[PDB]
């Protein structure tokens, strides 16, 4: 809850600005986030979680149809209740 300044680098999380756009790097933990001026979240993530990370950006598999596996684990046809 304490507002900090920027940039910021604690706990292996460099919180930087690149190309006038804000960045959050976690290369130890294998991810790089960022945002643009308008607001467009982006998430770069390694190959280490291939068939691991299940969530709202779906699994990191090859397929694209089966990447709605709910918090229970259920292939759903709706992109909404998921």
């Amino acid at each position: 809850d304490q507002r900090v300044s920027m940039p910021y680098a604690s706990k292996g999380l460099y919180l930087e600005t690149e190309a006038g756009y804000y960045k959050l790097s976690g290369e130890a933990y294998g991810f790089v986030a960022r945002i643009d001026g308008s607001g467009n979240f982006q998430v770069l993530l390694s190959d280490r979680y291939f068939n691991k990370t299940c969530g709202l950006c779906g699994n990191f598999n090859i397929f694209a149809e089966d990447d709605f596996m709910t918090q229970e684990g259920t292939l759903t046809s709706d992109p909404y209740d998921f």
């Binding site: 920027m6 940039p7 910021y8 680098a9 604690s10 706990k11 292996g12 999380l13 460099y14 919180l15 930087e16 600005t17 690149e18 130890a28």
Partner: protein, 196 residues
């Protein structure tokens, strides 16, 4: 004149050549020492990079990237790694004797690494004020080891190392309120005396 020796005692301290302990908790990547300083060729550019190391803990794995003879050999997580072999492989040498990684690079350069944190670069008579960086200038004069990149002496070393970081848009560290007790020992007088 004898062979001087930097060091990185613990997580966040630095011992210069002429001999000057000072405090610098950083988190960005920093220039430990180099030769490209003002009016010289710029042969070697040893760097150091820390991650999560403003408060010393079981964390703070270092990353060391050393740039000599157009090469790129670097080390972290126990082993060394070559990213770009340098031209004159003749002077190259690596001696994994005991705890250490002794590491020659020429007639007038050497490095040591205890596999965990310590960085102790060792120079010869050759330079005698040809370098700069965190470890200072290697001149014998001990109070001019705070000559920042903008060519002046500072007094508060937390502002010194902030000049020497590589990524000029990452975080400059925060001036801590000085006190003889760090975070945990602060207001925990009992524990302080078992460590003392």
């Amino acid at each position: 004149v004898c062979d001087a020796t930097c060091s990185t005692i613990g997580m966040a301290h630095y011992l210069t050549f002429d001999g000057l302990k000072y405090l610098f908790p950083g988190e960005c990547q920093y220039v430990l020492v180099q030769d490209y300083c003002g009016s010289n060729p710029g042969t070697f550019r040893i760097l150091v990079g820390n991650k999560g190391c403003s408060h010393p803990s079981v964390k703070c794995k270092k990353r060391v990237t050393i740039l000599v003879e157009g090469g790129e050999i670097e080390l972290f997580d126990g082993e060394v790694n070559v990213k770009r072999p340098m031209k004159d492989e003749t002077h190259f040498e690596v001696v994994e004797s005991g705890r250490y990684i002794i590491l020659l690079l020429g007639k007038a350069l050497s490095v040591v690494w205890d596999r965990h944190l310590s960085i102790s670069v060792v120079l010869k008579q050759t330079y005698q004020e040809k370098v700069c960086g965190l470890c200072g200038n290697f001149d014998g004069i001990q109070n001019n080891d705070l000559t920042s990149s903008n060519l002046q002496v500072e007094e508060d070393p937390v502002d010194f190392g902030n000049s020497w970081k590589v990524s000029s848009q990452c975080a400059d560290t925060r001036k801590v309120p000085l006190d003889s007790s760090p975070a945990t020992c602060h207001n925990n007088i009992m524990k302080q005396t078992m460590v003392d």
